[PDB]
Amino acid sequence: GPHMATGQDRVVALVDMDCFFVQVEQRQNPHLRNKPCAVVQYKSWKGGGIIAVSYEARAFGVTRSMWADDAKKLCPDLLLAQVRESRGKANLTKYREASVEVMEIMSRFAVIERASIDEAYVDLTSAVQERLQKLQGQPISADLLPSTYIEGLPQGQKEGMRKQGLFQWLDSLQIDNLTSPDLQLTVGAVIVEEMRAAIERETGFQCSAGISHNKVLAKLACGLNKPNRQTLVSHGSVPQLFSQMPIRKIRSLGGKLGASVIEILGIEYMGELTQFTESQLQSHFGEKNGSWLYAMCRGIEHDPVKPRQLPKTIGCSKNFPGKTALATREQVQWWLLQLAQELEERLTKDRNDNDRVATQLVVSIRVQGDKRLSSLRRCCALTRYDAHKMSHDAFTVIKNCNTSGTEWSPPLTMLFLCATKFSAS
DNA sequence: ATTATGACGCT
Ligand SMILES: [Mn+2]
Ligand SMILES: [Mn+2]
Ligand SMILES: [Mn+2]
């Protein structure tokens, strides 16, 4: 009882830009704002592949990883913005730069861990403590939480419900106890309101957020109320939330491991996990997964918010599907050069912005008819930021995959170059 | 013929 630690030591937030690429294009092109619109890559094959969808377009059924011609069938007024094309491939520079704008604002409040181009985690523990002392006993007004939902409330129109739940939460709050996890989460959500207001003020981009005691709960919370809303998931709300939460909705259980949790244990929802001992879980899923599952189904996870705002690897990738697969030597060389030229541009920009050089080049290929997504991955040294040298080395390192007797066989359906192992400059 | 990435575990 008194010695069962409840994983309530931390305040952790997950901030996620709503349909991020679409917002970047909507800021640039006002004629897209407040409309069904999506962002695509390429346009010849079925109108191109959609990778981001505005909420108005989502209400028609338009989803990511859908062909544009198909989405137009669901949403005939759909508007489309196209990813930039450079050297024959998609170039995502506009979005990496918008992402960095957002990250630099978030970093003014706390230390953040960039988790993807559009989302980061925040460790607010110190910030909440500082603020809690700044109030010196003053209660938290609902006015300070204008977009916050309290998960599990009310109990016993949408904005009316939100306000009722916030009112129940605040009325039941003990503002005098500077050590109550619920008060701490609450101050964290106030700071997250301020972070999101600064982001919208200074970039125009809207975002959702989750506020909880760890990364998995913060991430799960962020998704409960989108777009443009933030959700507080308290420790106390976990048993009811998890009691109907499909296992697959938890971060890292959406694929094969979650499928086998479901199949092996004979269960559907996160909460059923609590009925197993740690040893049973470890026996089925290994010692690490076992401990992690045993704590997670009770709302507890210790994965830290890493202080890492910049990517650890810088990569360039192009698929060559169907009949576009690269079948000759000249083709493989030209596309390796195009990839290495974009990689060189991004790496030089990186070294100048962030004072660091990569030291290792990773070359990855898929061959046609190969089941795997990486038919080969081989590393070599990266000593100078020169696109010709890097493409020549990537060739030197992949060339023994050709089984021709000028030709290339099996034809290549993917090239990939990744600069890694960064060291300060 | 979702594609372009990027983190992280396993051995
Ligand atoms: Mn997002
Ligand atoms: Mn998405
Ligand atoms: Mn995201």
| Domains delineated in chain A | 12-18+95-239 (3.30.70.270), 20-94 (3.40.1170.60), 314-424 (3.30.1490.100)
- Strands annotated E in A92-160: 111-116, 119-123, 148-150
Q: If you measure from the C-alpha of residue A52 to the centroid of ligand 2, how many angstroms do you get, rounded to a whole number?
A: 7
- CA-to-C1' span, A312 to B7 (A): 9
Distance A397 CA to ligand 3 centre (A): 34
What are the C-alpha distances in Å from A254 to residues A19, A90, A284, A362?
21, 28, 17, 28
Q: Which ligand is nearest to the CA of A51?
A: 2
- CA distances in angstroms from A330 to A24, A88, A190, A322, A411, listed in the order given: 37, 15, 58, 19, 13
Show the tokens assigned to A274: 């609590």
The amino acid present at A308, given as its one-letter code, is R
Q: Where are the beta strands (DSSP E) in A238-386?
A: 314-319, 326-328, 356-367, 376-381
The distance (Å) linking the CA of A128 with the C1' of B2 is 42
Is A350 strand, coil or helix? helix
- The residues near A408 (Cβ < 8 Å, ≥ 6 apart) are A326, A327, A328, A329, A331, A332, A402
Asked if A231 CB < 7 A from strand B, the reply is: no
Q: Alpha carbon of A80 to those of A22, A60, A100, A220, A319: distances in Å?
A: 9, 15, 24, 29, 22
Q: Enumerate residues 6+ apart whose C-beta is below 8 A from A171.
A: none
Reported as type and span, the H/E element at residue A209 is strand A207-212
Residues 6+ apart with CB under 8 A from A167: A142
* CA dist A253 → A66, A260, A264, A371 (Å): 24, 9, 14, 23
C-alpha–C-alpha distance, residues A425 and A152, integer Å: 49
Tell me, in Å, how far CA of A223 is from C1' of B3? Answer: 24
Distance A252 CA to B8 C1' (A): 11
CA distance A219 to A19: 16
Which residues, by Cβ under 5 Å, contact ligand 1, an ion? A 16-17, 118
Which residue has the least CA–C1' distance to nucleotide B4?
A317
Radius of gyration of chain A (CA): 24
Q: What is the DSSP letter of A141?
A: P
Backbone φ and ψ of A194, nearest 5°: -65, -40
- A216's tokens: 């998995």
Residue A83's identity, in one-letter code, is: V
A35 within 8 A of A25, measured Cβ to Cβ: no
Helix (H) or strand (E) holding A292: helix A287-296
Question: Which residue, among A223, A202, A214, has the nearest Cα to A102 in the 3D structure?
Answer: A202
Q: Which nucleotide is nearest to A66 (CA to C1')?
A: B2
Q: Does A384 belong to an annotated binding site?
A: no
Are the CB atoms for A384 and A348 separated by under 8 Å? no
Kindly provide the resolution of this structure in angstroms, with one decimal.
Answer: 2.1
Cα(A276)–Cα(A294) distance, integer angstroms: 8
